[PDB]
Amino acid sequence: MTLNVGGVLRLMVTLSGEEVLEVVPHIGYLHTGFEKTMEHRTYLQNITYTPRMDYLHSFAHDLAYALAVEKLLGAVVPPRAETIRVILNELSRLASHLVFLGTGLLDLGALTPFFYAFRERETILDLFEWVTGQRFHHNYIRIGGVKEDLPEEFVPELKKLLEVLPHRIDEYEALFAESPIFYERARGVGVIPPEVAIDLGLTGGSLRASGVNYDVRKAYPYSGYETYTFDVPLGERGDVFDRMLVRIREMRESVKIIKQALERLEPGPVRDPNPQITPPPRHLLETSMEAVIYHFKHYTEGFHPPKGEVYVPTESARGELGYYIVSDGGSMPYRVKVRAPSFVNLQSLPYACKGEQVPDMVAIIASLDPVMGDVDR
Amino acid sequence: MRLERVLEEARAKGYPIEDNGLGNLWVVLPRERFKEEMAHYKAMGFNFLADIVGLDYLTYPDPRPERFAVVYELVSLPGWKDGDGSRFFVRVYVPEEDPRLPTVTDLWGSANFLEREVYDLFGIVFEGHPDLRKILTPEDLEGHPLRKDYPLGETPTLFREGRYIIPAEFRAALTGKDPGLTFYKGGSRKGYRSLW
Amino acid sequence: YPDAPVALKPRFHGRHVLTRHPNGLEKCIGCSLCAAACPAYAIYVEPAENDPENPVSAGERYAKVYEINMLRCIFCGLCEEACPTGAIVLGYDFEMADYEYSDLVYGKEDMLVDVVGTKPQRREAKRTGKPVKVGYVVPYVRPELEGFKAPTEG
Amino acid sequence: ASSERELYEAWVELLSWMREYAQAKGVRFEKEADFPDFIYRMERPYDLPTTIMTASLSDGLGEPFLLADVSPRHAKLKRIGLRLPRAHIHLHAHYEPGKGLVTGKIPLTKERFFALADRAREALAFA
Amino acid sequence: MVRVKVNDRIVEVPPGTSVMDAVFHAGYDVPLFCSEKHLSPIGACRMCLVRIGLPIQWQPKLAASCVTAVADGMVVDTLSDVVREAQAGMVEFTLLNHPLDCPTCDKGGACELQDRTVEYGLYEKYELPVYTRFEFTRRHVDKHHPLSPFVILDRERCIHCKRCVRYFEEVPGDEVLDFIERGVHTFIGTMDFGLPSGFSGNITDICPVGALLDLTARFRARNWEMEETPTTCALCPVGCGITADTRSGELLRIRAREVPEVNEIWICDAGRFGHEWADQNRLKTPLVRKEGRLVEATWEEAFLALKEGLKEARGEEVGLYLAHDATLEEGLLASELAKALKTPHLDFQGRTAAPASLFPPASLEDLLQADFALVLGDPTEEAPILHLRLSEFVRDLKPPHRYNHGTPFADLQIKERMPRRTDKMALFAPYRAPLMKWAAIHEVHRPGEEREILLALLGDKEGSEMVAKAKEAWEKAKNPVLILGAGVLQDTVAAERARLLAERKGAKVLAMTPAANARGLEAMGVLPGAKGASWDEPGALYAYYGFVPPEEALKGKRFVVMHLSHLHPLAERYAHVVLPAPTFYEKRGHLVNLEGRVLPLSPAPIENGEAEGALQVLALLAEALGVRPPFRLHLEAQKALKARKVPEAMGRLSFRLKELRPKERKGAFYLRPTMWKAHQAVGKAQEAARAELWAHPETARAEALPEGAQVAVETPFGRVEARVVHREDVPKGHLYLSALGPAAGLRVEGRVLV
Amino acid sequence: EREGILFTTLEKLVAWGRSNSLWPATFGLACCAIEMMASTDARQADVMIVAGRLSKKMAPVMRRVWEQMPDPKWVISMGACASSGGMFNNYAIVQNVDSVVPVDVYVPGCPPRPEALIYAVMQLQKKVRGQAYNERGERLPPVAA
Numbered sequence A: 001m002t003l004n005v006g007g008v009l010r011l012m013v014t015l016s017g018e019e020v021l022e023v024v025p026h027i028g029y030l031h032t033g034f035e036k037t038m039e040h041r042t043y044l045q046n047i048t049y050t051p052r053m054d055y056l057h058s059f060a061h062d063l064a065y066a067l068a069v070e071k072l073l074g075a076v077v078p079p080r081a082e083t084i085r086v087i088l089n090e091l092s093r094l095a096s097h098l099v100f101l102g103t104g105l106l107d108l109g110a111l112t113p114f115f116y117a118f119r120e121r122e123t124i125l126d127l128f129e130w131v132t133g134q135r136f137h138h139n140y141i142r143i144g145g146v147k148e149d150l151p152e153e154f155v156p157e158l159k160k161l162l163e164v165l166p167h168r169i170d171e172y173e174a175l176f177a178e179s180p181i182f183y184e185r186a187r188g189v190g191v192i193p194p195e196v197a198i199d200l201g202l203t204g205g206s207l208r209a210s211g212v213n214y215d216v217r218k219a220y221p222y223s224g225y226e227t228y229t230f231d232v233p234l235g236e237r238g239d240v241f242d243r244m245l246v247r248i249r250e251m252r253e254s255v256k257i258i259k260q261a262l263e264r265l266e267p268g269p270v271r272d273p274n275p276q277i278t279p280p281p282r283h284l285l286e287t288s289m290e291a292v293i294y295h296f297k298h299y300t301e302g303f304h305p306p307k308g309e310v311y312v313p314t315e316s317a318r319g320e321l322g323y324y325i326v327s328d329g330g331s332m333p334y335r336v337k338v339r340a341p342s343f344v345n346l347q348s349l350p351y352a353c354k355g356e357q358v359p360d361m362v363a364i365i366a367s368l369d370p371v372m373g374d375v376d377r
Numbered sequence B: 001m002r003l004e005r006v007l008e009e010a011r012a013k014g015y016p017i018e019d020n021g022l023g024n025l026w027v028v029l030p031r032e033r034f035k036e037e038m039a040h041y042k043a044m045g046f047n048f049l050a051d052i053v054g055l056d057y058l059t060y061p062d063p064r065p066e067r068f069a070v071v072y073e074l075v076s077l078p079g080w081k082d083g084d085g086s087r088f089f090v091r092v093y094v095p096e097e098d099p100r101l102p103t104v105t106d107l108w109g110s111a112n113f114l115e116r117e118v119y120d121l122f123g124i125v126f127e128g129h130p131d132l133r134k135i136l137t138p139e140d141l142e143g144h145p146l147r148k149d150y151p152l153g154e155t156p157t158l159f160r161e162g163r164y165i166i167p168a169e170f171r172a173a174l175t176g177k178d179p180g181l182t183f184y185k186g187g188s189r190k191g192y193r194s195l196w
Numbered sequence C: 001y002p003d004a005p006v007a008l009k010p011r012f013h014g015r016h017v018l019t020r021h022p023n024g025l026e027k028c029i030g031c032s033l034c035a036a037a038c039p040a041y042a043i044y045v046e047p048a049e050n051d052p053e054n055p056v057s058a059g060e061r062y063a064k065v066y067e068i069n070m071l072r073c074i075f076c077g078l079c080e081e082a083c084p085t086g087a088i089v090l091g092y093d094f095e096m097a098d099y100e101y102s103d104l105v106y107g108k109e110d111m112l113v114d115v116v117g118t119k120p121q122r123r124e125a126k127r128t129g130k131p132v133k134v135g136y137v138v139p140y141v142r143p144e145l146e147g148f149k150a151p152t153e154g
Numbered sequence D: 001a002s003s004e005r006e007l008y009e010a011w012v013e014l015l016s017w018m019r020e021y022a023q024a025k026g027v028r029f030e031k032e033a034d035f036p037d038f039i040y041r042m043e044r045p046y047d048l049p050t051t052i053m054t055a056s057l058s059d060g061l062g063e064p065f066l067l068a069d070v071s072p073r074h075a076k077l078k079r080i081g082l083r084l085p086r087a088h089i090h091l092h093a094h095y096e097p098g099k100g101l102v103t104g105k106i107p108l109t110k111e112r113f114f115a116l117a118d119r120a121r122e123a124l125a126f127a
Numbered sequence E: 001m002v003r004v005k006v007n008d009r010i011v012e013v014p015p016g017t018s019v020m021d022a023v024f025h026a027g028y029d030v031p032l033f034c035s036e037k038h039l040s041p042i043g044a045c046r047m048c049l050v051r052i053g054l055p056i057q058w059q060p061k062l063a064a065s066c067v068t069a070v071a072d073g074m075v076v077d078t079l080s081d082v083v084r085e086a087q088a089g090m091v092e093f094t095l096l097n098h099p100l101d102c103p104t105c106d107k108g109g110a111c112e113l114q115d116r117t118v119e120y121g122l123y124e125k126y127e128l129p130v131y132t133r134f135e136f137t138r139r140h141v142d143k144h145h146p147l148s149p150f151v152i153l154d155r156e157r158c159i160h161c162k163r164c165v166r167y168f169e170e171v172p173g174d175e176v177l178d179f180i181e182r183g184v185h186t187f188i189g190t191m192d193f194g195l196p197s198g199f200s201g202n203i204t205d206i207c208p209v210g211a212l213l214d215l216t217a218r219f220r221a222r223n224w225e226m227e228e229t230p231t232t233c234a235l236c237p238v239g240c241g242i243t244a245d246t247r248s249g250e251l252l253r254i255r256a257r258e259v260p261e262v263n264e265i266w267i268c269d270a271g272r273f274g275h276e277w278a279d280q281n282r283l284k285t286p287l288v289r290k291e292g293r294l295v296e297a298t299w300e301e302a303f304l305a306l307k308e309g310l311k312e313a314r315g316e317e318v319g320l321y322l323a324h325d326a327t328l329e330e331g332l333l334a335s336e337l338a339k340a341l342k343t344p345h346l347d348f349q350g351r352t353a354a355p356a357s358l359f360p361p362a363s364l365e366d367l368l369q370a371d372f373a374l375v376l377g378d379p380t381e382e383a384p385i386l387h388l389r390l391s392e393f394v395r396d397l398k399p400p401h402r403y404n405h406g407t408p409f410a411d412l413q414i415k416e417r418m419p420r421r422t423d424k425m426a427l428f429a430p431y432r433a434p435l436m437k438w439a440a441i442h443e444v445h446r447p448g449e450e451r452e453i454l455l456a457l458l459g460d461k462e463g464s465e466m467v468a469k470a471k472e473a474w475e476k477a478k479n480p481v482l483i484l485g486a487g488v489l490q491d492t493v494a495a496e497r498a499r500l501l502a503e504r505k506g507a508k509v510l511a512m513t514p515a516a517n518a519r520g521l522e523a524m525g526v527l528p529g530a531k532g533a534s535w536d537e538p539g540a541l542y543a544y545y546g547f548v549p550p551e552e553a554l555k556g557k558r559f560v561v562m563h564l565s566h567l568h569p570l571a572e573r574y575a576h577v578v579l580p581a582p583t584f585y586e587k588r589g590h591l592v593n594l595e596g597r598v599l600p601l602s603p604a605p606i607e608n609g610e611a612e613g614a615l616q617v618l619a620l621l622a623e624a625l626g627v628r629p630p631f632r633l634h635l636e637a638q639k640a641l642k643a644r645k646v647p648e649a650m651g652r653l654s655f656r657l658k659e660l661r662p663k664e665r666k667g668a669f670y671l672r673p674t675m676w677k678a679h680q681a682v683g684k685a686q687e688a689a690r691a692e693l694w695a696h697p698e699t700a701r702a703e704a705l706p707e708g709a710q711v712a713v714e715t716p717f718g719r720v721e722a723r724v725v726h727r728e729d730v731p732k733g734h735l736y737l738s739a740l741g742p743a744a745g746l747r748v749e750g751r752v753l754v
Numbered sequence F: 001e002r003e004g005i006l007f008t009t010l011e012k013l014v015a016w017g018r019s020n021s022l023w024p025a026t027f028g029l030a031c032c033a034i035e036m037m038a039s040t041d042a043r044q045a046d047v048m049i050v051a052g053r054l055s056k057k058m059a060p061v062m063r064r065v066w067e068q069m070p071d072p073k074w075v076i077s078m079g080a081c082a083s084s085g086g087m088f089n090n091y092a093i094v095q096n097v098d099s100v101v102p103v104d105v106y107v108p109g110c111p112p113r114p115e116a117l118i119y120a121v122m123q124l125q126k127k128v129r130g131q132a133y134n135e136r137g138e139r140l141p142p143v144a145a
């Protein structure tokens, strides 16, 4: 008896009885085709195309890409930019997570706790609007560093929210930890054998939720995470109960990265002053012929990175993420392969919920935290 | 250190070793030796298979061995038993007339969805995959989008009074193989890199 | 809350506005640099030679036609960024929904600084004889929107 | 000093004589170029009196017989210049306190300017 | 060949090579301002400096790679800190007095100065980078000033290369531009105000910045915004490669497309500035006559109305008349339509009495390699680019070697201010022709008299002194070439003697045919049959027209179908079914060169309206005549040509033809062949494509004609107003009319209405 | 009848009627899907709102969803990707959902603020009341069928 159940994902769940014989997923419904259309844009222009895949923890795509390029032509990210980029990155982590957490607070009936998760997120998003002028898809990260400096109001407001979160995250851990129903709901279901997750590449930070200590910010450190006080949460046996919790723990360790980085924030530059890589200061466009030539040239046909191939792996709210850029010495990238954490993450969903019940199979996917934009792109 | 034992081995065995100064390194295996040699790689301690990226080299300014090529990312998770964190890329060029290349399905289970995308978007066939079916591109779509000679499929954007724009005739940005708007290109716009 | 005006930050990305200097000259010199940086091909520019007697801008070049497809537009501010003159600057309006595709391609006269309201707002406020009421409030106007009088009581 | 402002003040007036002589002897006055420090000044402040940096008195063909210019607000050694194109003759008017506009030691009055423009017009103008 | 080692790469390369070419030949690069393909190289900008080693014994100073020869076993370093520091410095000296216009400047993203600055300047010395060192008052001068109605000059932007002034002296030979003062004070200027030569638009594509710009296209779009359509220029027999630039259906600007075999990188002014009319006023729907007038009709209503006027027609009363610029495909179908539908009269707008196919075609290549140049006609006006291959031929220049990057950047063979050889050519023309300067043996005859000059050259009469020195010259000539255009090819007598002289001596010919696709249409069999009805002889009774014929051929006929592109007054009054047609700019298919080369036409995104190519219109009017045509579209038509075995693009197609239909000459007026064509008198080309009337100052004033008066004149080809000119070189008691069409080199009646 | 004060004054009553019994049925795709679940959280169905990039694979689906609806019905398009093809001009995305379904109102934004989508339905609201005209001056038909 084959039923056809199909977020914007479709599932061919084959099932006689009440168990689950085999789930055969079908994706391609949000296939925008970023990887092709990006072979047809500037390096600067692609910074608008990265946030649009994982639109939830979007900043990680921004950063993952900017990283592979900066390496490629060799740019030096100013101290102040490096700092603002981790605050900004993790402030985006909480946004994605808060959502995964929120979608959980409803399967679980907890309602005032949810109406709060939404308010937190809205307060994170207003911060984004404060510095980037948008809720998302902020065109803020740059190959040099960042678009511009941050406004005066940003620090004081980040302090408010960074002040009420500390124990706030604990409160959520609490409701799920002291799991009234949640226990009988998630504890057994969704078996992730440590050594099979490492076969299907379920990097998803719901990998460590099944006893594997692999977070890329630790194993292959990048934007100066190399130098932060950093706890990588773990889960005992890879069920959904632990997956849900792992992600709540990750929220504190984010909040601590934030406080830590917020300290080492001294005034300075925000992007690499190299004329070849970064358009000239705005004010001398009325004076230097070179500036004008540089500025004009910069914004029309971009700059040209050397012939070569690069890959830097980064950690998102969904696992390994990183752009594989083949440069041909042009104004635009020759190939742009994006490592979708959410795409490999889903091969571990047929095994995830095999033989299990059925109405459970909702929470059995929600726990894999997939964003279709990421899988399909 | 599990990586040095790969390199010390490819050196003796005539495998080219590719290295960019940025932190990535390759090892290009021939067509035949690829199958088995890769199985040997997992046995060597290579846990996790990160990605598999398909490459079309048709419109690349410099010439390469054959048109298509596939790259794999083998790792040893630092979060397990005796994981180093040794990661690396292995490349296989693949003839234009023979899009055939064995599956790694026996070895890594990641290679499932990853090989079908490389088959859907590039025309590359994998000998022995559970089911080589399209993944992302609509069912009736004919051909293989991600390869160079298949049209991006753009449409002119429209404005008020017969004023349209054709992107393919508008892009100021050059494209590697393009000589540009003046007579030729040289210098920093033939490829540029700072000196840290 | 279509009753209480939504406060947006002074940095927000709203309906593009073209600015003027004090002199009253338009800041735009129809260089079409903004259009050239637009990732979405949503700006069309036709230049024109200033009239020495009756000038539009400062150089020998001003913008005869200036058109942005508000449907195509993604709202990066890349255009505001590429501009050499401080001409095209994203403003605050967002209440700009409409019925016929080609009505949403704003023109130069929909965006000059003096203009107050989005296309649909002003049009309705036309056949109604009732002033335009914007639905936003901002703590203050960016320095970059010098002139753009809007609801800033804060 | 504050001379810079009085020199620019004097740039306006020289321009004033140009427009006068122009309408007067019925010969084309042509604004040749604006200050890029106005065109490309953005949100930045601008207090100068005009936006015209290069002026000229051209003939019927449009070929000039008199060229005039002052240096931008951001350039060093500000001078206002007069050149007879084609006849190799360049002038450099500075600004002295109390004295006024000088070409070194000789005051550059309306009269003296008109003299030069005439000499130039009769001699140089092709049509 | 010689062995050179650029940086880490070694290359073969012939002795004379410029180090600049040898450098680029290894696939390297170097700043390059003042040197240009096909011009004399001089180190003037001082940009292309390299370091040279020659025993390794580095020479002490840096060399201008563009004017340095290559020696055996020489090393060339283009990457040293010594090189690169010097470059960035030289880029700085350039941008020093430059204006700051980039956004406003029309030289946009296609500006060599801009590209070279971002490439080789702002040097990395090993935080805050310094963009500009110079902090003084930049050079201020004359700005936005038009030199001609086609060319506008910004002197402030000029970087003092010599690209322009050099070119005028060297290529066409018209020194109408030079520098003026000296020091930092020097500038480009003119005293020959109009910008005289008919090759003045070329400086437009060379000038490395936006000093010298195409005014025909001022302020339209930025260079990248233009969609570029490579095609061929069909305004005459040479068929120069061009690029057609368009944005939103309208025609913005014409430029030159390099195609070294034929024209090199040069276009003629009519070729480049007469586009005003092809996007401006045009017929957009099919017209049909109702009540003594024409009105709008669908292609449906017009296919029927066309079935009507022809239902009452026998297949031998049918006329098939194409325009001069019809495609090689449009002429093949018309040949077959007229073959099956047995008719004697099918012809083309420019057809010459004596077929250009008579003679063996000569390649422009051959012309440079030839020994003597026998010319009857004015190349300047008939086949303008021939002016420019003769400028090279006169200087003894010969076909350069071909490097990896094609035509050399610095041909050491071209010296600046080269001497010109007057012993190499002979010109014969109804007037003081331009290139008669570079010809010793020159003589001014009167219209249609070549018949006699040609007899003399064979050796059967006595010509003037010049015509004797000329016979003797072609005598001693080792491998000469014959060039001839109007009267020779329009007059059976001359043309027959012509082909004879050049038969005896094994020499090839350049027929400057008044029909553009002339050599090719003839190759398709689009020549009238025994009957006689030609493109100007009102003969048939029902006919198709691809143009506007002489009023004399319309008046009478029972059914007329004009397949125009614009609406003539002579059509809205004598036409029954008018059909919108595309220009050659928006067509597609092939042509054949005055040298027998087959060139391609590609279709520009111009506003065609409801227009359909004659290939379609012909197929549609073959149905309404019975037989179903063998040609539908281009893809399939291509098979039919490939069947007759016509070579691919760029190849030459050999095809001789012995037969000639003469006609008499009512010698009162002469249709002086001109460069500008008559339908180009739009906008700016308005004044330059006006008509002219030339007569000797006595006869001139004898027939009441002041030196500068606007006279109306009537010919078999129509009533045209025209400026009147005194010329002491015009033969007494004749009048020269500007033959601004493909009816040039004709003798006709007519008079001056008052 | 059809054009008589009586009839007309009913159909103006009926319109004003279901001008307030509008029952939005959101159809989330990508990023736009989540920015609407912020306006749903702040306060059989007619009025499908298309919110996100409409894939070509996904298109025939939204097709049936739309067909199998009641009849007095309206479509709202949310942001750049639904309205035009968005910044995504290529083989994989429909270049205006109006290719497949009659769009009644179009709302610019990427994605549009939540408070702008409120304005978007106040528009389609005042349009089924038949009180809306385009920029030419023409009165607009309440439903696009």
Ligand code: SF4
Pocket (backbone or CB within 6 Å): C034, C037, C038, C039, C040, C041, C042, C043, C068, C072, C073, C074, C075, C076, C077, C078, C079, C080
């Ligand atoms: S905001 Fe971005 S998408 Fe919109 S017009 Fe400006 S550059 Fe284009």
Ligand code: SF4
Pocket (backbone or CB within 6 Å): C027, C028, C029, C030, C031, C032, C033, C034, C035, C045, C063, C082, C083, C084, C085, C086, C087, C088
């Ligand atoms: S808005 Fe700015 S960038 Fe756009 S055409 Fe005007 S001056 Fe140029």
Ligand code: SF4
Pocket (backbone or CB within 6 Å): A293, E098, E099, E100, E101, E102, E103, E105, E106, E107, E108, E111, E113, E114, E157, E209, E210, E211
């Ligand atoms: S000539 Fe070149 S460098 Fe000078 S203003 Fe024009 S584009 Fe800029």
Ligand code: SF4
Pocket (backbone or CB within 6 Å): E157, E158, E159, E160, E161, E162, E163, E164, E165, E188, E206, E207, E208, E209, E211, E212
């Ligand atoms: S006008 Fe142009 S081509 Fe002539 S010298 Fe000056 S820069 Fe060179």
Ligand code: SF4
Pocket (backbone or CB within 6 Å): E233, E234, E235, E236, E237, E238, E239, E240, E263, E267, E268, E269, E270, E271, E272, E383, E384, E385
């Ligand atoms: S010589 Fe003839 S083919 Fe060449 S540009 Fe001039 S008209 Fe065109």
Ligand code: SF4
Pocket (backbone or CB within 6 Å): A052, F029, F030, F031, F032, F051, F052, F053, F078, F079, F080, F081, F082, F086, F109, F110, F111, F112
């Ligand atoms: S319009 Fe923008 S926000 Fe909405 S789906 Fe498209 S990319 Fe996402």
Ligand code: FES
Pocket (backbone or CB within 6 Å): E031, E032, E033, E034, E035, E042, E043, E044, E045, E046, E047, E048, E049, E064, E065, E066, E067
């Ligand atoms: S000196 Fe100008 S290119 Fe050689």
Ligand SMILES: [Ca+2]
Pocket (backbone or CB within 6 Å): D030, D058, D062, D063, D064, E142, E143, E144, E145
């Ligand atoms: Ca002038």
Ligand SMILES: [Mn+2]
Pocket (backbone or CB within 6 Å): A174, A178
């Ligand atoms: Mn507790």
Ligand SMILES: [Mn+2]
Pocket (backbone or CB within 6 Å): A190, A191, A351, A352, A353, A354, A355, A356
């Ligand atoms: Mn299980």
Ligand SMILES: [Mn+2]
Pocket (backbone or CB within 6 Å): B123, B143, B144
């Ligand atoms: Mn296939």
Ligand SMILES: [Mn+2]
Pocket (backbone or CB within 6 Å): A286, D037, D041, D044, D073, D074
């Ligand atoms: Mn200033």
Ligand SMILES: [Mn+2]
Pocket (backbone or CB within 6 Å): E143, E144, E145, E146
């Ligand atoms: Mn001017």
Ligand SMILES: [Mn+2]
Pocket (backbone or CB within 6 Å): E250, E251, E252, E275, E276, E279, E280
């Ligand atoms: Mn035109």
